[PDB]
Design a protein around this ligand. Structure first.
Ligand SMILES: O[C@@H]1[C@@H](O)[C@H](O)OC[C@H]1O
Ligand SMILES: O[C@@H]1[C@@H](O)[C@H](O)OC[C@H]1O
Ligand SMILES: O[C@@H]1[C@@H](O)[C@H](O)OC[C@H]1O
Ligand SMILES: O[C@@H]1[C@@H](O)[C@H](O)OC[C@H]1O
Ligand SMILES: O[C@@H]1[C@@H](O)[C@H](O)OC[C@H]1O
Ligand SMILES: O[C@@H]1[C@@H](O)[C@H](O)OC[C@H]1O
Ligand SMILES: O[C@@H]1[C@@H](O)[C@H](O)OC[C@H]1O
Ligand SMILES: [Ca+2]
Ligand SMILES: [Ca+2]
Ligand SMILES: [Cl-]
Ligand SMILES: [Cl-]
Ligand SMILES: [Cl-]
Ligand SMILES: [Cl-]
Ligand SMILES: [Zn+2]
Ligand SMILES: [Zn+2]
Ligand SMILES: [Zn+2]
Ligand SMILES: [Zn+2]
Ligand SMILES: [Zn+2]
Ligand SMILES: [Zn+2]
Ligand SMILES: [Zn+2]
Ligand SMILES: [Zn+2]
Length: 316
């Protein structure tokens, strides 16, 4: 809509206050004109029609419980935009400042959130398995990173390529969570999963086995469920990424940690320059090694640590 750029205030899913960029034309709309071609957040009104209505509010105050999913979808899309622009010089998910559109209150009791090829879609959860999923910055950035992948390497969504696709989204979801630097960790979805249970999450990057996911290539899932285990086998790559950043000793292999920023630079370069739709784990290792070589030199600690981490998880 055409209007004046304004700044509203509200509370997110977890009760935290934050400012949001809005547009004023009779109503205050969740339309942030400060980032690229805009960030737009929509009310799906418990339907499955998309995108729904551009979110309208009478007073630029967003403290109602019904507002909270919209506040967080809008704000965390902004954080994700800021991460990709400030850290990687990438303008929105397509690198060409595409508008970021999000719909909240999608369907009823819907325990999922997804990038659908042109926008983000957030269920409210059923209140037991999940609360509204836009409350999780890592979920928001995980799904928007699928769009990044789609516009770069094009990793399919099955078998090893799909597990890399998933891990890439977990890695950058987590790096966005650290960039926001409110309550970061190496867990996925902890803020919105199981409100009755403290200390759990959908999966752990630092210890995938905590939830039964593999932390070594020899433990990879080879069945047909979950598109060949894409959310399961991602633990193998997630653990390698965790080791690259934080270091550690894993199955007897010592990894010297190089920190989060270099982890992100290495994997971003691998994703955008070297991966292809059918890259497998071994090819991801090669891409990460070459990316670290490009950035830091073949004799660098960074290259050596990439190799150590993939050795530790059994990927040659
Ligand atoms: O409403 C305006 C918006 O449509 C435009 O894109 O950028 C400036 C805004 O104030
Ligand atoms: O924590 C990371 C920060 O250290 C780096 O500067 O850029 C990415 C962030 O996630
Ligand atoms: O977040 C990590 C945590 O999972 C681990 O237990 O201790 C080190 C941290 O980096
Ligand atoms: O020890 C873990 C176990 O507690 C869980 O039930 O399944 C996965 C294992 O890694
Ligand atoms: O062969 C693998 C071994 O090298 C490693 O130590 O742990 C898992 C095994 O499958
Ligand atoms: O069966 C597949 C297995 O061969 C591969 O290694 O990892 C993904 C699985 O789907
Ligand atoms: O196969 C790819 C290779 O061509 C390139 O050199 O680095 C990435 C690899 O995965
Ligand atoms: Ca997290
Ligand atoms: Ca929980
Ligand atoms: Cl560990
Ligand atoms: Cl471990
Ligand atoms: Cl460790
Ligand atoms: Cl271990
Ligand atoms: Zn209001
Ligand atoms: Zn998803
Ligand atoms: Zn995903
Ligand atoms: Zn967290
Ligand atoms: Zn899955
Ligand atoms: Zn998923
Ligand atoms: Zn270990
Ligand atoms: Zn460990």
């Amino acid at each position: 809509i055409t209007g004046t750029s304004t700044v509203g205030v509200g509370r997110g899913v977890l009760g935290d206050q934050k400012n949001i960029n809005t547009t004023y034309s009779t109503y205050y709309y969740l339309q942030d004109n400060t980032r690229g071609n805009g960030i737009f957040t929509y009310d799906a009104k418990y339907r499955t029609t998309l995108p729904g209505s551009l979110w309208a509010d009478a007073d630029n105050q967003f403290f109602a419980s019904y507002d909270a999913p919209a506040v967080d979808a809008h704000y965390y899309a902004g954080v994700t935009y800021d991460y990709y622009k400030n850290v990687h010089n990438r303008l929105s998910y397509d690198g060409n400042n595409a508008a970021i559109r999000s719909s909240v209150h999608y369907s009823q009791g819907y325990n999922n959130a997804f990038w659908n090829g042109s926008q983000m879609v957030y269920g409210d959860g059923d209140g037991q398995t999940f609360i509204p999923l836009s409350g999780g910055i890592d979920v928001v950035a995980h799904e928007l990173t699928h769009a990044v992948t789609d516009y770069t390497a094009g990793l399919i969504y099955q078998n090893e390529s799909g597990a890399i696709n998933e891990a890439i989204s977990d890695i950058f979801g987590t790096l966005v969570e650290f960039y926001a630097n409110k309550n970061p960790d190496w867990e996925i979805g902890e803020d919105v999963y199981t409100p009755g249970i403290s200390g759990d999450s959908l999966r752990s990057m630092s210890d995938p086995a905590k939830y039964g996911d593999p932390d070594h290539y020899s433990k990879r899932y080879t069945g047909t469920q979950d598109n060949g285990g894409v959310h399961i086998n991602s633990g193998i790559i997630n653990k390698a990424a965790y080791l690259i950043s934080q270091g550690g000793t894993h199955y007897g292999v010592s990894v010297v940690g190089i920190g989060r920023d270099k982890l992100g630079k290495i994997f971003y370069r691998a994703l955008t320059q070297y991966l292809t739709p059918t890259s497998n784990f071994s090819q991801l290792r090669a891409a990460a090694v070459q990316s670290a070589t490009d950035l830091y030199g073949s004799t660098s600690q960074e290259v050596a640590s990439v190799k150590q981490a993939f050795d530790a998880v059994g990927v040659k």
